[PDB]
Amino acid sequence: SYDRAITVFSPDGHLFQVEYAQEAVKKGLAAVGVLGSDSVVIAVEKKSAVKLQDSRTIRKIYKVDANIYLAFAGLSADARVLINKAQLECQRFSLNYEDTMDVDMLVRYVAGVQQKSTQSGGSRPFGVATVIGGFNEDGKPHLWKTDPSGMCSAWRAVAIGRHDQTVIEYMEKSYKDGMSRDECVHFAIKSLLEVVESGSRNIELLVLQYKEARYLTEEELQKFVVEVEKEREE
Amino acid sequence: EYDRGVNTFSPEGRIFQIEYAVEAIKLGSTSLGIRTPEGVVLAAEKRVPSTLVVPSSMSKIMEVDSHIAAVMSGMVADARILVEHARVESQNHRFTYNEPMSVESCTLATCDLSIQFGLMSRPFGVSLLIAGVDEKGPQLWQTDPSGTHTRYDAQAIGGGAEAAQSVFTERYHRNMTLEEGETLAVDILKQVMEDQLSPENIEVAVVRADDGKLHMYTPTEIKAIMSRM
Amino acid sequence: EAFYGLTTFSPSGKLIQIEYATTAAGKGTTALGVKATDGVVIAAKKKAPSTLVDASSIQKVFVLDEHVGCTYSGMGPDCRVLIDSARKNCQQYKLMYNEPIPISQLVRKISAIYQEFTQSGGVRPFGCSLLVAGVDANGYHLYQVDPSGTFWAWKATAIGTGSPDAKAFLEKRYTVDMELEDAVHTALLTLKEGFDGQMTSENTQVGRVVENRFEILSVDQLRDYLDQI
Amino acid sequence: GHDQSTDVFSAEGRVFQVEYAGKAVDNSSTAVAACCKDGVVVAVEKVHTSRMLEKGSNNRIHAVDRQAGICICGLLPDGRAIVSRARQEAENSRDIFATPIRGSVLANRVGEFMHAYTTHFAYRPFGCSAIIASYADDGPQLFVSDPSGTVAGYYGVALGKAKTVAKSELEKLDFSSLTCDEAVGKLASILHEVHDKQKDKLYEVEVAWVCDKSDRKFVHVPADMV
Amino acid sequence: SHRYDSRTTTFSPEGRLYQVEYAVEAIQQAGTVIGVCTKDGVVLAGEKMVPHPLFDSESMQDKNTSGEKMYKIAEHIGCSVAGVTSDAYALLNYARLSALRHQYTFQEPMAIEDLCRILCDEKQLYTQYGGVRPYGVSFLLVGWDRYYGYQLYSTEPSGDYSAWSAYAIGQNDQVAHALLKKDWHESMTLEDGMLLALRVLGKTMDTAKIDLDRVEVAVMRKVPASNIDQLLDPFKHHPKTTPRFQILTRSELKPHAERADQAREAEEKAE
Amino acid sequence: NEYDSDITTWSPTGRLFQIEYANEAVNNGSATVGVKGKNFVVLAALKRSPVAELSSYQEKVFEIDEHVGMSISGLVADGRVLARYLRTECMNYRYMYSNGMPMNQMADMIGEKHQRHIQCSGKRPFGVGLLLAGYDRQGPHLYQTVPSGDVYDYKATAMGVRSQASRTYLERHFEHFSDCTLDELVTHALKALASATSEGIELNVKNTTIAIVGKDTPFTIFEEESARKYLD
Amino acid sequence: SIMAYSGGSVMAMAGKECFVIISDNRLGEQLKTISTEVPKLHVVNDSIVYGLTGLRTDQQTFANKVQFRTEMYKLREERDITGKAFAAMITSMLYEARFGPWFVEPVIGSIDKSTGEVYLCATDLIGAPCEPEDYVCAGTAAESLHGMCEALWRPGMSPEELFEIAAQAMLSACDRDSLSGYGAVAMIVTKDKVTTRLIKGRKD
Amino acid sequence: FDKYITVFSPEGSLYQVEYAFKAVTYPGLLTVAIRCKDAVLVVTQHLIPDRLMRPDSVTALYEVTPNIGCCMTGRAPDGRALVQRAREEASDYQYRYGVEIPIAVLAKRMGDKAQVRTQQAGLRPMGVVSTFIGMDQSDQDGSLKPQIYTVDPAGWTGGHIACAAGKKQVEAMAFLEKRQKSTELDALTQKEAAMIALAALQSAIGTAVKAKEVEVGRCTAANPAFQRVPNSEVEEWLTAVAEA
């Protein structure tokens, strides 16, 4: 088997392959997560809406288990692999422990797969950050992020992809605890529009409440984009 | 950077990837450890990247077992791996010998995973401090990416380490109380941190000699330390 | 023990090792094939380095199974690899289906081996092209396989050195009506075009697919065809 | 870039990494050996760096079987690797074939083993020449396997830094007539002449033989004959 | 040997994977393929290479299983490839087995999007593990399943894939996209899609008329089911219609190509 | 230097730079001395000396079986690997033959282990020097080993930093060691070990280990009670 | 016996440019009948039909393996497998499992579409073929079916004559086998035409 | 980059294989083989400059099996290794088929072995030309015909009537071509053949050879086993060359 060492320290302490995976995640589409009282909101940029892509709904927020949902930024195909692994892990877990996987457990599994790939000979890192959101089987909502180094962290709100840090600086200023469902969706839409152009056909947005996951219809979303783009003039 | 393979010695007799992994530990958040006869203290700069982070989630101090704690500096994800192995090893020891693993035996078994690179592409970019209490009383060790453990009485790792080894040289005596230790810990962090030291910005834990159990200071109890200074 | 790939894409999108293998495979001597309504003929120059080579021992045309034959251009020993594998495949197929492998399936199997050596680690591609000629339930066939692993059914073609000119001369003389006596005559005439020196039943080899079988002409049988050109 | 791996020919069909390992052998301490009608004697100059070694340290002469031995010239550790392989061959001959390994066979095996490490990008050639001294059923035999794995039989042989001189001195001996007794004297004497004193201040001369007097057992010679 | 490793699965400094970027360059050199997803079927129209007069047919007995550009993966799944042809055949064989393993296990047709994920997982692998070069191939898959109806995906060498209503891979894909943008709509018949597929294909390869010699067309559509053998499993339900991948003979395609000359003559009158 | 990056590469002068570089690892470890009397072998190793009130153990010296043990210098983690190896080989041997593994055989082994790591790609030399001291039927032994795989049988030796001076010292006195008593062997070791201290540091119980092994004396690292006796 | 557990019998016979293959319909666990609507025939293509007998789970498994193989064949090869290949293939598959066999006993009928040459082949469970010119058969009622086919079968029968003696034989024999019955399904296969018929039988 | 690994150059050539051919001539030894009506001979130089080296110990002739000899020309230890592999091949073949391996098959298998080293990276091609000689039974009459098969570092295998490899392989060949326009070489006698071989060796190396500077191997229809020809008889041929 090919087991050359791909990820290695350079002189000044850095792991270039991991810095470059992270560069691939800064080129990816933005995604944003917001945590309210009883809701997690995951919102992602879509690439645009060319008249050619299938008008059948393709989700860019992925379901990992009943209770857990994952957005990503970076290489689509890497992401798809991570997600399949995550999906398969949550089932392995149900199957071993009967209980459903806590979100944090799922996140740690994923981050470990990411970390593992910065240290496995033969492989480059996944060039993927993830936002992961969901509720445990105790009504507590969570929101996490993984980066390609394999580091995860829980957040009250978060952004990944292009201009992540512009968006995170924005959100630090505004964000309050104990938002409502509707204030969450607002806050997420607001935050995304810091970097996305229109709010028309280039935002998918998912709302997670204990035991109920629901994507905004393109209509429900547009009442929120007007309600928000009208608040950006001021 | 792939010019030299990873098992290569420099002309000074150092393995290059090890020296580089060490360089990565100087980019890390400062962590530190203080042996006292009443117990050990670990303290870490959390160094969060945002107020939006939930600080419990960026846990630079980790229960290895009821009586052992570790605190990393460097690449956190790499540290999660080592601590998982320590946890497994400490628990295999209880399983097999029905008693708590010594702290040294634990540190060894965590270095036993760091030798392995050619297997692991590269070394872990992580230094631990591993405080604990066993039969020989409170103890503090340091792992390096070399795989070389080293018992210490006080230590720092991270960007702080040089400024914090100044302060230990002056203020650390082999005979301080657990509260004078807590205090010296938090002092050092105040001095070397980038940010303003607040009760959420840091993480403090102790393993007390008397019960031999590890307590993680809540933000409250860390204020109770900042109080007296 | 080398597992990295040797054939890789280049900034224009080309797989250069495969272009070079293709260059190598057109540096052989001329081989060519002519399909006809009732058979196929393949024919090669055996340009022996010296007269002291036992020309009986040089094989440029090969049986792969009763019904199918090949010849090749470019690097002999690389081709010997392909032929060995193709012979095995013919036989594996008979063992399974108790019928002869159809030429289409055989060539796809060859094509696949070529492709593996364009991607698998450690190996360079094959520097030879094949003609494969045979007869199955779909009739007579003649295929060219290149080192890319690409293959083409042809009605007539030529690989190796004099090949552009040999192809040009087959374009003229080829007719869809052609019977096999005329095909052989044409094949041998086409070789003779770019042949430095007399053609003999020593320095040429010829294979024909006729009825339901492939056979390499004897020197006796080939001498009767070379007395009529 | 023609010379970094032994898996590579230069444009003149040389393999440089083997020539280079060769130089390791030539910059090493000198050995000589003589194959008489009654046995083989091999001697070698051990150069110490310290005044405080034990006598016996860094033996370069190893028995490989009852009737055979290998004197290493060049990097001693690499040689102990060969010695281990020779011993495995000797054991195999006894275990499977129930015969002591003939010396030509042993030296061929040694050569094959050394050569193998000149073919593959992942290993390097050995930096040592083995002198093999046997006295099995094929009679007294003296071979040398060099780092290329090339093996040759000799009546007498000299390796290492003084090899060119030591060969001139070995040519003065009459191999048809010479006996193992005389040879221990001569071969040792030779290593004292060609030893350079202002470079390598500390040295013993280790000698070993396999001969009719030693019951065809390969042994260091008693330090009375030297 | 490690000095000579070209490090195919490494990132470059902008998080780019060069071997995958250059596989894509290899694909933009290939024969164009157009796909148009209607509601009466899916159409693939591809540029064959120029037909030397000495090419033969393989004389295969089943005319619809493969052509030069178009291959059947299963009764319900077809594809067309652009890029390194031999890589295609490696993958195509993989896709065939996968679809049939799915059918082994579940005894129902594999859905198009799962076949597609399987395929692109196999490609993604080579961009991450293994130190060899990627597959230098792009599919257009088509087919029909009960979940989503007619579908048309396209894959890339990275292993990403996307669903489309119409799309193009190969030579002048940017140009062909722009032209499908303008002329695709949601309510096309099969004949309309076949037209659109040819108008675009003929517009990208710069021909006055469509050159029947240089064009292959395949269609994936549902047709009445013939071999309902119902006494043989009584409980099994057999749908009235079943998907069929069809490659058009030169004659079946002649009408549709004339009818696309006529809508290229009637678009040079307005000018 | 085009030739110093790989253990599988000879240089054109017939050198193996990765092995000369591994040697540097050893020349830069903390000094250690050993000496060999008639019946005993003494190892003494400099440790690292307190940074004010602020200590620091590292295990330099290792017991390996009852009758042998060792002192390392250089890359401590390689030490541990070698220690684990020797320990294990000594237990296998003692399991099989119910007696200690003889030292000349153990030195043969430790040297073969090293050689296994200087000939193939992606292995590397051990960057550690050993003094191995032990006692068997043939009496006491003291071996130094080095990354190159060489094993020297010494009467006395030192290695590590500034250990050239330790070797100057030992060269004056070493011819007597066969007659010395255990206390004078230890004195001689300590003296030599001290010729290797930096400027105005001196030997004391917390920057110096002593191990002895010998006749009717299993290999014994000395702790703070027994060490004090010898260090004054 | 494991080969008898699930019950069922199959039989194929040749005529002039035609064959009939016929199965009974029962599926059991020993004497428990589970279903009376389980014909054991599979159609590979217009010219090949086969039946399996033996342990029903293995009939199912193996038939599915055969359908993978045959569909794969047809894609790779771009033609229909022929009965000789088909039977060779089967034999191969069964023999792979020689040391842990599929408890099935296939019975294959086929007709070359051109010629009209008819090929029957039955195999034991490890894939020894039996390629007679008349009729082959297998399953629980196999002794009795040989009885009947010997008696009734003659060379050069036409589809209809051949159907009648196939059916009488399958029924007469199944009426003497506890594990086979509930009438039969029969496929008559010519060059031009396939005709399936469900035949009425006893309900015991 | 292509000069050091087994990939193709832009001209479509494998440098490391070409250079392996230079390894064949580098030693400076020439070999010649020749078949006559009922025998085959191989003659190779056997140069012992070192007075102290033991001539009988160094050889380029090797029994592969009792009925197949070979002469390796080139990098000696690489030759020795191919011989081992040949031997293994021959022995595995006898075990599998119950018969001694025909020499054209053995050659072919050794060509396969070499070819592999030219297509799999990081294995050095063996820098030798292998020359197997032996007799070979015909299926018609059962008569033994003599054979010479070479294998070269590219894996190119060939049968020959006569063949030379090594230093001056060109001037040796030129001489034999020239002597093949006169006579028919497969109608010669073991003597007339050996004379031609020895004369070709002498022509090429520009010197007269003595018996002990060559070593000659032979198989004959009468005695098919491969045997070192004794010096007495080589002396007599060398005498027969200097005269006529």
UniProtKB/TrEMBL annotation, chain B:
GO cellular component: cytosol; nucleus; proteasome core complex, alpha-subunit complex
Record lineage: Eukaryota, Discoba, Euglenozoa, Kinetoplastea, Metakinetoplastina
Organism: Leishmania tarentolae
Domain Proteasome alpha-type subunits: from-to ranges: 2-24
Official protein name in the record: Proteasome subunit alpha type-5
Keywords, comma-separated and alphabetical: Cytoplasm, Nucleus, Proteasome, Signal
BP GO annotations: proteasome-mediated ubiquitin-dependent protein catabolic process
UniProt family annotation: Belongs to the peptidase T1A family.
Highest taxon listed in the record's lineage: Eukaryota
Localization in the cell: Cytoplasm; Nucleus
From TrEMBL, chain D:
Nucleus listed as a keyword: yes
Gene Ontology cellular component terms for the protein in this record: cytoplasm; nucleus; proteasome core complex, alpha-subunit complex
Record carries keyword Protein biosynthesis: no
Biological-process GO terms, alphabetical: ubiquitin-dependent protein catabolic process
Keywords associated with the record: Cytoplasm, Nucleus, Proteasome
Domain of life: Eukaryota
InterPro entries: Ntn_hydrolases_N, Proteasome_alpha, Proteasome_alpha-type, Proteasome_asu_N, Proteasome_sua/b
SUPFAM superfamilies membership: N-terminal nucleophile aminohydrolases (Ntn hydrolases)
Matches recorded under Pfam families: Proteasome, Proteasome_A_N
Subcellular location: Cytoplasm; Nucleus
Domain Proteasome alpha-type subunits residues, every copy: 2-24
Function: The proteasome is a multicatalytic proteinase complex which is characterized by its ability to cleave peptides with Arg, Phe, Tyr, Leu, and Glu adjacent to the leaving group at neutral or slightly basic pH. The proteasome has an ATP-dependent proteolytic activity.
Similarity comment: family membership: Belongs to the peptidase T1A family.
PANTHER family membership: PROTEASOME SUBUNIT ALPHA/BETA (PTHR11599)
Protein name as catalogued: Proteasome alpha 7 subunit, putative
Organism: Leishmania tarentolae (Sauroleishmania tarentolae)
TrEMBL record, chain F:
Domain Proteasome alpha-type subunits: 3-25
Main location: cytoplasm
Keyword Coiled coil: no
GO biological process entries: ubiquitin-dependent protein catabolic process
GO CC terms of this entry: cytoplasm; nucleus; proteasome core complex, alpha-subunit complex
Stretch forming the signal peptide: none
Keywords: Cytoplasm, Nucleus, Proteasome
Localization in the cell: Cytoplasm; Nucleus
Domain of life: Eukaryota
Keyword Nucleus: yes
Function as written in the Swiss-Prot or TrEMBL entry: The proteasome is a multicatalytic proteinase complex which is characterized by its ability to cleave peptides with Arg, Phe, Tyr, Leu, and Glu adjacent to the leaving group at neutral or slightly basic pH. The proteasome has an ATP-dependent proteolytic activity.
Family: Belongs to the peptidase T1A family.
Subunit note: The 26S proteasome consists of a 20S proteasome core and two 19S regulatory subunits. The 20S proteasome core is composed of 28 subunits that are arranged in four stacked rings, resulting in a barrel-shaped structure. The two end rings are each formed by seven alpha subunits, and the two central rings are each formed by seven beta subunits. The catalytic chamber with the active sites is on the inside of the barrel.
Protein name (record): Proteasome subunit alpha type-1
Organism of origin: Leishmania tarentolae (Sauroleishmania tarentolae)
Source organism phylogeny: Eukaryota, Discoba, Euglenozoa, Kinetoplastea, Metakinetoplastina
UniProtKB/TrEMBL annotation, chain H:
Domain of life: Eukaryota
Alphabetical UniProt keywords: Cytoplasm, Nucleus, Proteasome
Chief place of localization: cytoplasm
Family: Belongs to the peptidase T1A family.
Protein name according to UniProt: Proteasome subunit alpha type
A Gene Ontology cellular-component term: proteasome core complex, alpha-subunit complex
Organism: Leishmania tarentolae (Sauroleishmania tarentolae)
Keyword Nucleus: yes
UniProt domain Proteasome alpha-type subunits: residue ranges: 1-23
Annotated localization: Cytoplasm; Nucleus
